[PDB]
């Protein structure tokens, strides 16, 4: 009896217990069977695994492990192109130099044969869609026109599985992807927490069997505290853990002692950024935090918490859309960030004009589209648009804007992700009237008016909070504000505070109030 | 021969591998003139090896011109009889037509996707052995499949079959051993349906209406029936009549009425061979030129069939339209408005829908004049109509139904569904007493 | 490798000159896996060789096949545990996160216009060779030079 796999207990993998089972049944069940029933069946073996996903998610690992540890052969591997050559025909010929040790082998051993494997990698480089390839005719066209000719070729070789892998699967030709040339198109993606901890269990098992690790590390906490890590990142987390321990442990004068890993995640999660959320993106936009000056802030961020809980819980509203109106210099983005920071959804990338400058609207809308397509990977997410009227160019005078970015924006607001996923799209603006005029406002599912500070009462209690002005001088500002109304927003306030502060103390408050006369007026 | 397999670097070896092909078949011609054993050649993926001589971009080599040797060999000065040669190509249009003219290659035959009933032959021809050796239950219905596969072709048809045998094995297949059990009694039974759903993509995707249809269709009164009847009375226009091979419909209504959703409903109810939804969702950031080319390609492949339907959703977004000031892209408009009144060749029937939230923009752009007809989608106008709708939905119990029902009928409602869902939802999330009060208070401002 | 040396008019030679680098290390890793010595590689300019391959910067970047080959080579199906590649940019943002992610290049560092202490140490370095031979001992205030020089590089 011939079985190509004597042992795999578990190999180098966690989180994929679905995907490995699917790929296994599809492409190794025909292999592992009684032959008699399969020739009763009259079925031809599936070949042609493809693996498409984002980077750092463990695809070439999988291909490596199956090919070289699961079944008995040595696989021929092309690293990117190895193929291409300066001479015509020899590039193409290297393809058949791959297949020409298994073709005759099948010819002269019949059905039963030792399996041959080919692992392509970065296959999108060698193969791309014809007619759009490097000009009209294309340079890369005959390698692919041979490859298709061989894989399903007239010889009907039955003895190979081709394992491709990509980060850009749309490039790959449907002609090559139809069943039998590559049968299985398999997404592998950012793991869920239980798979995520499996990763850590694996990479820490060899460290755990030995007692170097310290008892204070419960990896479930680490699962909670790295949400989206691909696992290529996660090894790096562990790897730099070991490194910090070693440096703690030591011209060089390495002092020879026995060492223990501890506080890895706590120390260096702050170091490494990720494909998913950051802790640090927030402190840019909220530098001062959010001080509570009244019931308005309660109302606003409670509505936000309420709404994210709606999205999390409910179905038949896969997406929601909100925007925050305020007058200018009434913080919109602070609220919009703190909402997400309290929502604890796993994926947040703010889309802001500030990181896009000088960009023509084409590459602009491609960027926002990239963000939303990244977000559609995860199971749920919160995306912030801010300063919309500057995101899409806007001026009142002879009114002008980019049409393209507008339409891309609001179709995305009206767009649904693949089912089961859920998100909210938060937006900000200082004006919603022009948005009514361009009829994108209806697309936003709901709005929140952010009020602006209306009362010297709210002002002076905010100043109790900030603590910049003490009570003695504040007695004067009380007598100034009482009975009068104020329109100023706090982001302008927080300028006025220091603008007055830098004067001498005697003229301090007099300048402050005489200045504040201008805006309240 | 595989397609480039001829090609080699040394300047004359490319042609000198072709003459190897035809030397036998001309030598036996010479020796025996009248007859021979019919040495036949099979080219494969011929489009690469032979394409038009006058394009060198990317090649920078003369070896694009092996073709001259080829066709100067095939008929040549020396006629060669008792040879057969067959080309095979995905891409038909790049071939130098010097060898498409009759007598070098006679026939241009185009194999299209399988027809619905021929697909049954395609299915039964594979399952013959599976049934003859009694690995097939009598419950599975190949016809139930064959109607349930819209665009499955060939390998795509065989993929569910091959997968089904695998999924049926895998149970009996099963750690360190990974034992293969001995049990040989099995058959895949109604797991081909499951795999038909999940595992392959069709390769031409209409499978997902879900993004368009979240809730199906709540049948909420007489108007929805009136609409669906007008539509399925209109669909018969194509199928019956050959003097109106093209028909064109508008769906006119206010926003948030699910017009583009029930368009998909009527499409799937028409059950045509080729159906499509041209979305602005799929096309984003595309400049007006590419936005025209995509639509162009859609209608072009739709013409291939003996009939088709296509819907165009949110044309006001598709051709980018904003007032503040009139502004839009014109080329997409021109393309669309030509295509409405482009009659397909020789009664290959077409149906078109478009949807808008605005007719007042369109009647000056002269688009609905081009459309054959238009049908209105009225949206819910009253408390009774609304209450029937939400009791079809659920998610208000009888006390809440009444609690609303007291004070609705005295009032007049202008609402639409796509808003109503969000209203009931966000009001619902609040605590139980608060739920209906909030729903109400939202409706106070929204429907007024 | 100093900037591109690689890029060649002909197809495939621009990937041959790339894998030329690492083939010297591959053989050694295979012969001795465990205890082999490092082959360090030093890219003076990364950004010119590899810029984003995402069908951006024109058609498929510029000759993005190079970066395909590279990120296939260093993190490829062979382990290749025996090298670290140095890379250096004054234009970092172009580079693909696929390449910068942990394991192909884990560590991205910023070096920035130094504070007074660094701007002292660097001066003391460039001056110690010359003082040790007692050429200048004259009334030269180093702290004063440093604090006079605000941002210099």
């Amino acid at each position: 009896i011939i079985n190509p796999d004597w042992n795999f207990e578990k190999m180098g993998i966690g989180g994929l217990d679905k995907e490995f089972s699917d790929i296994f049944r599809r492409a190794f069940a025909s292999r592992v069977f009684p032959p008699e029933i399969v020739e009763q069946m009259g079925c031809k073996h599936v070949k042609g695994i493809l693996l498409y996903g984002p980077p750092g998610c463990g695809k070439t690992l999988l291909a490596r492990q199956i090919g070289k540890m699961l079944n008995a052969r040595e696989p021929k591997v092309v690293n990117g192109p190895e193929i291409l050559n300066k001479y015509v025909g020899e590039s193409e010929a290297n393809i058949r130099k791959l297949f020409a040790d298994a073709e005759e082998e099948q010819r002269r051993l019949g059905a039963n044969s030792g399996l041959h494997i080919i692992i392509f990698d970065e296959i999108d480089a060698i193969c791309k869609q014809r007619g759009s390839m490097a000009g009209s005719t294309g340079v890369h066209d005959t390698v692919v026109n041979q490859l298709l000719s061989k894989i399903d070729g007239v010889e009907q070789l039955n003895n190979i599985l081709v394992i491709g892998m990509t980060n850009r699967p749309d490039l790959i030709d449907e002609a090559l992807l139809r069943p039998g040339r590559l049968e299985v198109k398999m997404e592998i993606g950012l793991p869920d927490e239980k798979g995520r901890l499996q990763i850590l269990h694996i990479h820490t098992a060899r460290m755990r069997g030995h007692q170097l690790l310290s008892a204070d590390v419960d990896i479930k906490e680490l699962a909670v505290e790295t949400k989206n890590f691909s696992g290529a990142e996660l090894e790096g987390l562990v790897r730099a853990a070991q490194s910090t321990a070693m440096n703690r442990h030591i011209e060089k004068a390495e002092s020879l002692q026995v060492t223990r890993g501890d506080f890895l995640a706590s120390l260096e999660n702050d170091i490494k950024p990720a494909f998913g959320t950051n802790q640090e993106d927030y402190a840019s936009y909220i530098m001062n935090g959010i001080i509570k000056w009244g019931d308005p802030v309660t109302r606003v961020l409670d509505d936000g918490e309420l709404l994210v809980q709606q999205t999390k819980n409910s179905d038949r509203t896969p997406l929601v859309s909100v925007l925050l109106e305020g007058p200018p210099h009434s913080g919109k983005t602070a609220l919009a960030a703190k909402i997400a920071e309290e929502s604890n959804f796993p994926f947040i990338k703010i889309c802001s004009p500030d990181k896009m400058i000088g960009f023509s609207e084409t590459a602009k809308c491609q960027a926002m589209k990239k963000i939303f397509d990244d977000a559609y990977k995860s199971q749920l997410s919160c995306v912030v648009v801010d300063d919309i009227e500057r995101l899409l160019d806007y001026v009142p005078i002879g009114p002008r804007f980019s049409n393209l970015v507008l339409q891309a924006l609001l179709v995305l607001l009206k767009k649904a992700p693949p089912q089961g996923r859920k998100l909210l799209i938060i937006g900000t603006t200082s004006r919603k009237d022009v948005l009514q005029e361009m009829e994108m406002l209806n697309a936003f599912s709901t709005t929140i008016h952010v009020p602006n500070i209306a009362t010297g009462e709210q002002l002076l209690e905010a100043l109790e909070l900030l603590g910049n002005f003490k009570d003695k001088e504040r007695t004067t500002i009380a007598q100034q504000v009482k009975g009068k109304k104020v329109w100023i927003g706090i982001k302008k306030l927080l300028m006025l505070i220091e603008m007055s502060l830098q004067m001498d103390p005697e003229y301090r408050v007099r300048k402050f109030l005489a200045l504040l006369r201008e805006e309240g007026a | 021969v595989n397609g480039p397999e001829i090609l080699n670097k040394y300047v004359g070896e490319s042609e000198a591998n072709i003459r190897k092909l035809f030397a036998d078949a001309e030598e036996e011609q010479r020796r025996l003139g009248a007859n021979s054993g019919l040495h036949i050649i099979i080219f494969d993926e011929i489009d690469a090896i032979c394409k038009q001589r006058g394009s060198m971009a990317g090649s920078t080599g003369v070896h694009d011109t092996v073709v001259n040797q080829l066709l100067s060999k095939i008929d040549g000065v020396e006629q060669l009889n008792n040879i057969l040669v067959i080309g095979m190509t995905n891409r038909p249009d790049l071939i130098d037509e010097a060898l498409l003219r009759p007598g070098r290659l006679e026939v241009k035959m185009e194999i299209g996707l399988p027809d619905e009933k021929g697909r049954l032959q395609i299915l039964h021809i594979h399952t013959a052995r599976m049934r003859g050796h009694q690995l097939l239950s009598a419950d599975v219905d190949i016809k139930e499949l064959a109607v349930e596969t819209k665009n499955f072709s060939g390998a795509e048809l065989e993929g569910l079959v091959r997968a089904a045998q695998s999924t049926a094995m895998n149970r009996h297949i099963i750690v360190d051993m990974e034992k293969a059990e001995s049990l040989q009694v099995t058959r895949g039974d109604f797991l081909a349906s499951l795999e038909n759903d999940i595992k392959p993509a069709f390769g031409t995707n209409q499978e997902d209406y879900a993004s368009y249809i979240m809730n199906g269709i709540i049948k909420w009164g007489d108007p929805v029936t009136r609409v669906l009847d007008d539509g399925e009375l209109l669909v018969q226009q194509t199928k019956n009549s050959d003097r109106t091979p093209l028909v064109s419909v508008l769906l006119e209504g206010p926003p948030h009425s699910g017009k583009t959703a029930l368009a998909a409903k009527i499409a799937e109810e028409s059950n045509f061979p080729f159906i499509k939804i041209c979305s602005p969702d799929k096309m984003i950031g595309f400049s007006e030129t590419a936005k025209c080319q995509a639509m162009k390609k859609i209608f072009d492949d739709a013409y291939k069939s003996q009939l088709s339907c296509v819907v165009v959703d949110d044309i006001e977004r598709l051709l980018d339209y904003v007032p503040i000031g009139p502004r839009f892209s014109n080329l997409v408009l021109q393309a669309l408005l030509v295509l409405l009144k482009k009659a397909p060749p020789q009664g290959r029937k077409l149906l078109i829908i478009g949807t808008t939230s605005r007719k007042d923009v369109l009647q000056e752009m002269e688009m609905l004049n081009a459309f054959s007809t238009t049908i209105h989608v009225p949206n819910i106008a009253t408390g009774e109509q609304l209450l029937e709708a939400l009791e079809l939905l659920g998610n208000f119990k009888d006390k809440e139904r009444t609690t609303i029902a007291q004070q609705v009928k005295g009032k007049k409602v202008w609402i639409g569904i796509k808003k109503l869902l969000m209203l009931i939802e966000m009001s619902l999330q609040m605590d139980p007493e608060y739920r209906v009060r909030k729903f109400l208070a939202l409706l106070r401002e929204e429907g007024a | 490798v100093n900037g591109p040396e690689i890029l060649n008019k002909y197809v495939g030679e621009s990937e041959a000159n790339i894998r030329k680098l690492f083939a010297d290390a591959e053989e050694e890793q295979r012969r001795l896996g465990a205890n082999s010595g490092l082959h360090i590689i030093i890219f003076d300019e990364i950004d010119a060789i590899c810029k984003q391959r995402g069908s951006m910067a024109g058609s498929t970047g510029v000759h993005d096949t190079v970066v395909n080959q590279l990120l296939s080579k260093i993190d490829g199906v062979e382990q290749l545990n025996n090298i670290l590649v140095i890379g250096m940019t004054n234009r970092p943002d172009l580079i693909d996160e696929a390449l910068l992610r942990p394991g192909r290049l884990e560590v991205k560092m910023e070096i920035g216009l130094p504070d007074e202490k660094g701007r002292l140490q660097i001066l003391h370095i460039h001056t110690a060779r010359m003082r040790g031979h007692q050429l200048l001992s004259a009334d030269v205030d180093i702290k004063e030079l440093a604090v006079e020089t605000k941002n210099f590089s």
Partner: peptide, 17 residues
């Protein structure tokens, strides 16, 4: 520019018989 041309060329065999 924004020019990528990648090209190939062919051999002229020497006579060593």
């Amino acid at each position: 520019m924004a020019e990528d041309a990648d090209m190939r060329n062919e051999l002229e065999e020497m006579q060593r018989r």
